[PDB]
Each structure stands twice: as structure tokens, then as C-alpha cells.
Amino acid sequence: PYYAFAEPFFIHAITHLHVGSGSSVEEEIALPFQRDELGYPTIYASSLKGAIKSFLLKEFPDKRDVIYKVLGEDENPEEASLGTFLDAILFAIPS
Amino acid sequence: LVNAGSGSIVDYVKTVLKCIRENLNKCSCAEKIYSNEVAKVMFRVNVEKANVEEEVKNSLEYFETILNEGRIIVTPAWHVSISSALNRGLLVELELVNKHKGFVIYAGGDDLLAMLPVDEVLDFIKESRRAFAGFGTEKLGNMCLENGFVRINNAYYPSLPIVGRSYSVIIAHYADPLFFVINDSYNLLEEGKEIIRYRVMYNGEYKDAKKDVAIFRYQGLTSVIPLSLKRPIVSSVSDFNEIASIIDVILELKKRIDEGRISVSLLYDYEKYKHLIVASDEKYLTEFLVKDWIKRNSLRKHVEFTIDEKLYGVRLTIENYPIKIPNDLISNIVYTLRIIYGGE
Ligand SMILES: [Mn+2]
Incomplete structure (x- = not known):
């Protein structure tokens, strides 16, 4: 087992969400959503990780060492994180 | 004559x-x-x-x-005058290096080999290229250079305001082997000065030009900043300030990026404007185009820092070498910013 635990999960939007695209691409929309390789909307796991980590560092203010171990120290890192986020695939959209 | x-x-x-x-x-x-x-x-x-x-x-x-x-026709007086001015400009550059926390390995007359922080390299380049032409505002010991000469307590010794000067900058990790660092420095300052052509007009005609540039390198990034944009690089007392004028622009722009008036997205956002602007053909059109490119990373409220309209149309060529370079001076300005930051 390369990975100790594998936690697949769904991401149900509660409100409308806007993860912005980083790109020098000139698009029509001034601030588009993040796109996968098929043009579908996606969430780069960079953004998943940053947001979920910023949330966890507050919800569980005592376990900040467990979090800094699984998701990496912030300002002076000495080690690779132990947890990985995969990019969020679109799975179902309401129409 | x-x-x-x-x-x-x-x-x-x-x-x-x-x-x-x-x-x-x-x-x-x-x-x-x-x-x-x-x-x-x-x-x-x-x-x-x-x-x-x-x-x-x-x-x-x-x-x-x-x-x-x-x-x-050269006579001994010609040689001794050039050599004396070389030594005096050297004495000026000795305290220009020391003005920027630098360490001289060899500063002799024409050439120079120093080590400065990555922070004051652009300042030093600008002031050094200007002092080589006798144009400065500081006293550098006992020597107070004055608009093409070198005043030393009423002694007006000449300078080299006609001689260009190239500049190599290697942003190097302190653990980088000095053999390859020094060799890359020398090979840039040799190959590039012979091998690059940038637009210049003298007599009012867009011609080419080879020397008097500043090459930068950061582990793969390269940029060139022309230092004269005039082939009799100075001929009037007027053109003494034109020397290194592009460099103070990069310094001002880095002065805005640091203080949080522009975002470094500026350095990753010029490509889209570049197509439009190099095919562009009217002056004030390109003026507004750069003004609004900056004005998407914003520079100020009620924008106040524009590029000085001599920078456009300047196209840098290269004789088909592994040194890849943008063919335009503003993209080279932003690559110089990328290279300076990349080492901080
Ligand atoms: Mn040579």
C-alpha cells in the first residue's frame, strides 16, 4: 500500500462556489471558474488543500501538529506532507 | 575634427x-x-x-x-589620455562598488568583476554605466564627476562618454560551483555582446547596434537591457542622462511592486498585451495599452507611472543562438524583473 488511507469523497455545493482560474488566457468572462482538460469545471487540489487546511487549522486548534504533519508546515518546512489531495472532478451538475 | x-x-x-x-x-x-x-x-x-x-x-x-x-591617427598623448581616464573611472567604480556592499575580485580600468547582493545590482549597474561616462551626482571620495569629465578639486580630467559598456549579471546560489558561474558570466559577456542586435536611430534612421547592453541570467531565464539607444551614445551634454534610462524604469517598477502597488502578476500578464502591442503601429495607442496592462495590476490610484514611449518599437534580435530572448524591450524589462526577484 503506497497510501495508508484512501478517502474518496463528494463535494456537495451548499451555495454557489467560485474557485478562480489562474491563467494568462484571455477569456470572455473576467473571472472564470477553474477548468479541467475537457473544459468542465474542476477544483485544483491546490485549492482544495489550501482551503481545507486553512479551515482545519481553526476548527481543531489543538491538533495543529497532526495537521502540520499531514498537510505540511507553513512557513519553515522541513519535510514533505504525508497527505495528498486529488483534483476535484465534476461529478453531477444540476440543470 | x-x-x-x-x-x-x-x-x-x-x-x-x-x-x-x-x-x-x-x-x-x-x-x-x-x-x-x-x-x-x-x-x-x-x-x-x-x-x-x-x-x-x-x-x-x-x-x-x-x-x-x-x-x-593615434599619438602617445592619445594613449596616455585614454589610460589615465581609464584609471580614474576605475577609482570612481571602486567606491561605486563599495557604495553597494560589494566585493571586488578584479576592477581594473575598463573591466570589472564584483559580487553584490541581488538587491542593489540594478542600482549599481545604472550608476556605474553613468559614471563611466562622467555623469553622476555623488562625491566618490575626493572625486566629484561632472557631466563627461572627472572634477578633482578644480582638476577636470577627461572620461569615456563615447565608449559603451556591456554588463553581465549572474544570479547564483551561494552553493553554485564558481567555475561554472564565472564561466557563464564570461561566456554571456562575450557571446551576447557580439551576437545581439537592438534597434537604434542615429541621424534619424532605425538602424541596428551590437554592444552596450546588460545581460541577466537566472538559472535559465535571460534578458537584455540596452544601455544607450543612441549610437554616438552621447554627443551633447543633453544625452548624458539618457544613459541607463531603461534601468531606472525597471527600478521604479520594482519600487512599485515591492510596496504593494503592483502585483507580480504584472510579470506574468504582459504576454497577452505583447501580441497587440508589437503589431501595433501608433504611439499613443501603445501608450494606453501598456497603461491599461499595468492598470490591471494597478500601480496607483489615478495611474501615474507610464513607460516613456521611447521603449516601444525597440526590437532586440539575436544571431540564432541558444540564448533565447524576447524580441522587444518591455518583455525584456519584465524578464529582468523576474530574474532580480527570482534571486530574492
Ligand atoms: Mn571580448
Whole structure:
């Protein structure tokens, strides 16, 4: 087992969400959503990780060492994180 | 030549040159020039002898040799003057390096090999390239350079405001082997100065130019900043400030990025404007285009820092070398910013 635990999960939007695209691409929309390789909307796991980590560092203010171990120290890192986020695939959209 | 004289002599020399003009004549135009030389010897009271026959002919023969060969005939005074000015500019640059927390490995006259922080390298480049041309505002010990000369407590020693100067910058990790660092520095400053061509106009005509640049390198990123954009790099007292003018623009822009008035997205957002602007053909169009490109990363409220409209149309070429470079001066400005930051 390369990975100790594998936690697949769904991401149900509660409100409308806007993860912005980083790109020098000139698009029509001034601030588009993040796109996968098929043009579908996606969430780069960079953004998943940053947001979920910023949330966890507050919800569980005592376990900040467990979090800094699984998701990496912030300002002076000495080690690779132990947890990985995969990019969020679109799975179902309401129409 | 005509400017080298001081006094009514200039009339004689320029009318001789007119006698040399368009293969005009010898033995014939030696009268118009002579109806003033003999006028001058008769303008005094104790002259002894004149062999104007030999003398005006030799005087025309001198300039004829100068033009036929194509070079000012060098005499020992020429060499000792150039060498003295070289040593004095060296004394200036010794304290210019020390003005920027630098360590000199070899600063001798024409050349230089220092080590500075990545922070004051652009400042030092600008001020050094200006002081090499005798244009500065600081006292650098006992030496107070003045607009093309080197004033030393009333002694006005000359400088080298005609000689260009190239500059190599290697942003290197302190653990990088100095063998390859020094070799890359030398090979840039050799290959690039021979191998790059950037647009310049002298006499009002867009021509090419080779030397007097600043190459930067950061582990793969390269940029070139022309230092003169004028081929008689200075000819008036006016053009003394034009030297390194592009560098103070990069310094100002880095002054805005640091203080949080522009975002470094500026350095990753110019590509889209670049297509439009290099195909663009009107001045104020490109003016507004860069103004709004900056004004998407914003520079200010009520924008105040524009690019000075001499920077456009400048196209840098390269003779097909592994040194890849943007063909335009503003993209090279932003790559210089990328290279400076990349080392901080
Ligand atoms: Mn050489």
C-alpha cells in the first residue's frame, strides 16, 4: 500500500462556489471558474488543500501538529506532507 | 575634427575639409584656405617665414590620410589620455562598488568583476554605466564627476562618454560551483555582446547596434537591457542622462511592486498585451495599452507611472543562438524583473 488511507469523497455545493482560474488566457468572462482538460469545471487540489487546511487549522486548534504533519508546515518546512489531495472532478451538475 | 578646435582656427579647418569635400581639389582650393592663413600671419607684427606651400598641403594631407584610412591617427598623448581616464573611472567604480556592499575580485580600468547582493545590482549597474561616462551626482571620495569629465578639486580630467559598456549579471546560489558561474558570466559577456542586435536611430534612421547592453541570467531565464539607444551614445551634454534610462524604469517598477502597488502578476500578464502591442503601429495607442496592462495590476490610484514611449518599437534580435530572448524591450524589462526577484 503506497497510501495508508484512501478517502474518496463528494463535494456537495451548499451555495454557489467560485474557485478562480489562474491563467494568462484571455477569456470572455473576467473571472472564470477553474477548468479541467475537457473544459468542465474542476477544483485544483491546490485549492482544495489550501482551503481545507486553512479551515482545519481553526476548527481543531489543538491538533495543529497532526495537521502540520499531514498537510505540511507553513512557513519553515522541513519535510514533505504525508497527505495528498486529488483534483476535484465534476461529478453531477444540476440543470 | 571641426569641433576639436577652439578659436578662429575652426574656420580654417572646416574650409580645408570643404576643400577635401567631394574629392574637390588639391593645389587649387589651397587659396581660399590660404587667403585666411596668410591673412593671419599678416595679422601680426613679428612673423619670420612662411612655407604655406608645404604647410597647407601637409595640413590637408593629414585629414586626407585620416579619412582615407578611417581612423584618428593615434599619438602617445592619445594613449596616455585614454589610460589615465581609464584609471580614474576605475577609482570612481571602486567606491561605486563599495557604495553597494560589494566585493571586488578584479576592477581594473575598463573591466570589472564584483559580487553584490541581488538587491542593489540594478542600482549599481545604472550608476556605474553613468559614471563611466562622467555623469553622476555623488562625491566618490575626493572625486566629484561632472557631466563627461572627472572634477578633482578644480582638476577636470577627461572620461569615456563615447565608449559603451556591456554588463553581465549572474544570479547564483551561494552553493553554485564558481567555475561554472564565472564561466557563464564570461561566456554571456562575450557571446551576447557580439551576437545581439537592438534597434537604434542615429541621424534619424532605425538602424541596428551590437554592444552596450546588460545581460541577466537566472538559472535559465535571460534578458537584455540596452544601455544607450543612441549610437554616438552621447554627443551633447543633453544625452548624458539618457544613459541607463531603461534601468531606472525597471527600478521604479520594482519600487512599485515591492510596496504593494503592483502585483507580480504584472510579470506574468504582459504576454497577452505583447501580441497587440508589437503589431501595433501608433504611439499613443501603445501608450494606453501598456497603461491599461499595468492598470490591471494597478500601480496607483489615478495611474501615474507610464513607460516613456521611447521603449516601444525597440526590437532586440539575436544571431540564432541558444540564448533565447524576447524580441522587444518591455518583455525584456519584465524578464529582468523576474530574474532580480527570482534571486530574492
Ligand atoms: Mn571580448
